[PDB]
From TrEMBL, chains A, B, C, D:
Transmembrane feature ranges: none
GO molecular function, one term: endopeptidase inhibitor activity
Residues given in the record as chlorophyll b binding sites: P32, T48, L49
Keyword match Signal: yes
The protein's name: Water-Soluble Chlorophyll Protein
Gene (UniProt): WSCP1
Keywords: Signal
Disulphide-bridged cysteine pairs: C41-C90
Amino acid sequence: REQVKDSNGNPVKRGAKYFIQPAKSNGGGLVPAAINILPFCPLGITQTLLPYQPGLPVSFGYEPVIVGTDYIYTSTTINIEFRSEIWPVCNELSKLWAVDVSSSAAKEPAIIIGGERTAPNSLFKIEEATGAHTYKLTTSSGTVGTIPGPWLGAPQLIATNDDAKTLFVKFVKVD
Amino acid sequence: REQVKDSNGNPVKRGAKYFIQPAKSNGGGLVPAAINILPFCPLGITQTLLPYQPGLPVSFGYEPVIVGTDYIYTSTTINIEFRSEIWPVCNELSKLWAVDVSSSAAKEPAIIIGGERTAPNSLFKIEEATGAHTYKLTTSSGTVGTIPGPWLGAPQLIATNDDAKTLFVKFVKVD
Amino acid sequence: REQVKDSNGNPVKRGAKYFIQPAKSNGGGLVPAAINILPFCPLGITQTLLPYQPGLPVSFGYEPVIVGTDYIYTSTTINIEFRSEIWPVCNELSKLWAVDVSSSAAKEPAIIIGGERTAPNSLFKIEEATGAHTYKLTTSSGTVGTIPGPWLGAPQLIATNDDAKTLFVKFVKVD
Amino acid sequence: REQVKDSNGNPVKRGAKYFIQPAKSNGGGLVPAAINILPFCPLGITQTLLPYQPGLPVSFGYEPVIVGTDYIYTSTTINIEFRSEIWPVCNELSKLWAVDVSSSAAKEPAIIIGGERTAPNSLFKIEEATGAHTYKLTTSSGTVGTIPGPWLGAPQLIATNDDAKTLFVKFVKVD
Ligand code: CHL
Ligand code: CHL
Ligand code: CHL
Ligand code: CHL
């Protein structure tokens, strides 16, 4: 277990805002986007294709609670939540990431938004990967990966046992 | 081979307008609807869920050409085209039904709109089923069936080898 | 005051389902449609451009209550509500028609959906017009008219003091 | 006439990429967004409400041509064009800004996207305003201003003679 480092080499602090940015990519950061038409709640998570769009900010917090430290460590369960004043749709749902565990869940399930803090489908871990300050995300439903999704095939986040799909990311401190 | 009959028992005439109406259903007729977000062309085909919506009209014509008869027969290749003055999207494409044979085609492929008159993926046959004036549609990619689609799970037309999915229809003469 | 007659000459019954159909038109009936993008609630009301689309059904009821008669009369306050099992958006709002009296209300205000039974902006009257079984609708904000709206300029219902905009309708009994 | 300066005090260079960023605001930069539902082409221009969204990049070029200088000066006609590899809709139209001069043009007309290089409705000027490196944009249809538009009332660009609506901007060099 080590301190997760942001793209500047500084440790990632609990509750602080980060953009999650796919590594070795021409696209921007991770953002909410609908994966279904109607209903469109809950939203999925997508890499925007547009180069200078940094993503929607997230913050990390330990779950279950770990008291005493300000830093996020690898291989330890956290919640990931989008941080936005403006949120016009899907308001009956939270902004925590979670694996889709509904009855319509794909064999390789969507990462959606609206998980319950304590539910098991809401628990992620950050794990080191090769490259500087490059990481992967894992859940109890598999590694976080992408498939071409409904927005011009923009990467769409799923949980997957296929290593080829793994999403490698950096955390860019919101400045 | 027999004359296909409309819901009033009258033979179906080439080039005349019919609604295609799922049998034993509380929903309305078959209509264009997007199956993808962006791009949304080509459109797919859906049963509307709304009870009094009769569908968008279609017409049937023989392909290859059969000269001499005014009536549509079973077990004979036809094109099916939507008939609408108003058509605001997907205008570079035709209004003929076709099986999706693109590279992103699902294992059970979508019925889409925009087929070429002569292409093989544009050829349907009407086949008798049980019930009065009830029929099924077949293509060289399988029988026409539905799966719950993106519009509140409204039936979405596919080509399928699964008999459980078969869409049974009547043709209601546009009056 | 006279009994309002449907398109077959039969009196209009309280609580029964009617389509509202613009007279002397090539379009279909009146339907819910968004007049704003985001938020899209509350919905407005539009004439569909498509020829065989009959509209979404409505029912008429007296407000304030008139007890003893089964029939709708002219020049008497009623509510108009859309009647639909399926209603996927704007669910915190009712299906009663009402004049928009919000703070963003246009000088010629939109007819919207989601009025309170007793509120004054929810009160319509049916008034005779020329032509057989042709009527107009009025509210305390003006006569019901249309302007070209956001759906390919499809007639969009407003309340207006301009006689040129008046919407003439028939009521087609849902069969 | 002076050299227009970016947000770092450096002169603005012809053909280089800038974000246009409203001054004294909590929102992000200027972006394409639909102002009509259907058709949605041509697109309008909006300030995104989201704080860290920098805008879609633009570049400035003299029109009519001014040969010999690399810098953009005030009070001189230019074109403004969005610069994006990805452009999925409205492709029959250009990416140059222009005042809407169609027959449905509002009394205070929309700034749209898709102007012809030489047409007069495509000609902007940058003019100094108070504040450091703060500017306004003007056209022969009036000063560039905003009204609350259809995206949660996000500022929507118009041409206006009302000084209260003026949009004050800085140009942030795309890095
Ligand atoms: C209704 C829910 C909802 C939908 C549909 C979307 C959709 C999208 N978001 Mg998300 N979001 C949604 C909720 C929210 N988002 C965000 C915050 C963000 C941010 C910060 C960003 C996104 C972005 C995106 C886009 C990422 C895909 C891309 O690369 O395309 C790019 C493709 C285009 C730019 C072309 C135009 C897309 C256009 C905006 C929508 C086009 C609509 C279609 C024509 C509709 C078609 C209908 C079909 C069914 C017929 C995608 C358009 C990213 C983006 O790229 O935005 C520009 C982005 O940076 N979202 C928040 C917090 C405020 C939400 C709250 O609910
Ligand atoms: C952009 C392309 C396009 C899209 C998205 C649709 C979509 C639809 N068509 Mg089709 N059509 C489209 C092209 C065309 N249609 C038609 C002709 C028809 C007819 C005659 C009918 C349809 C109907 C339908 C609907 C059938 C599903 C249902 O049962 O839901 C019913 C669900 C509702 C009524 C709820 C509201 C739906 C609303 C109109 C759209 C909601 C938009 C979402 C909020 C957007 C969400 C964005 C996401 C990505 C975040 C569906 C909404 C049927 C229908 O039901 O219409 C009412 C119908 O009867 N279409 C023509 C010829 C003119 C087209 C030409 O291009
Ligand atoms: C999200 C809310 C909502 C929206 C956007 C609409 C929109 C519409 N309704 Mg309504 N409805 C909505 C709620 C509901 N409707 C209905 C019941 C009906 C009925 C019965 C009918 C309508 C129809 C219509 C259409 C009338 C205009 C027309 O003539 O165009 C016709 C234009 C087309 C057919 C072209 C394709 C339209 C397509 C379905 C939507 C296209 C989406 C755009 C690409 C999105 C663009 C995004 C922009 C911002 C970039 C319009 C598309 C009528 C219709 O024509 O449907 C086909 C119709 O008959 N509605 C119910 C009860 C179930 C609703 C419940 O919430
Ligand atoms: C279809 C055409 C089209 C539409 C509808 C839009 C729409 C939008 N663009 Mg634009 N764009 C479009 C074309 C393009 N855009 C861009 C590049 C960008 C950038 C870089 C950005 C935008 C952003 C925006 C948004 C600015 C408003 C805001 O503050 O809301 C914010 C509101 C939300 C985030 C909530 C969710 C919005 C969601 C993406 C769409 C929701 C759809 C509705 C549910 C549909 C409702 C249907 C109605 C009719 C019933 C708005 C959603 C900005 C943005 O904020 O994106 C996130 C932004 O940063 N656009 C390009 C170049 C690639 C385009 C090319 O065609």
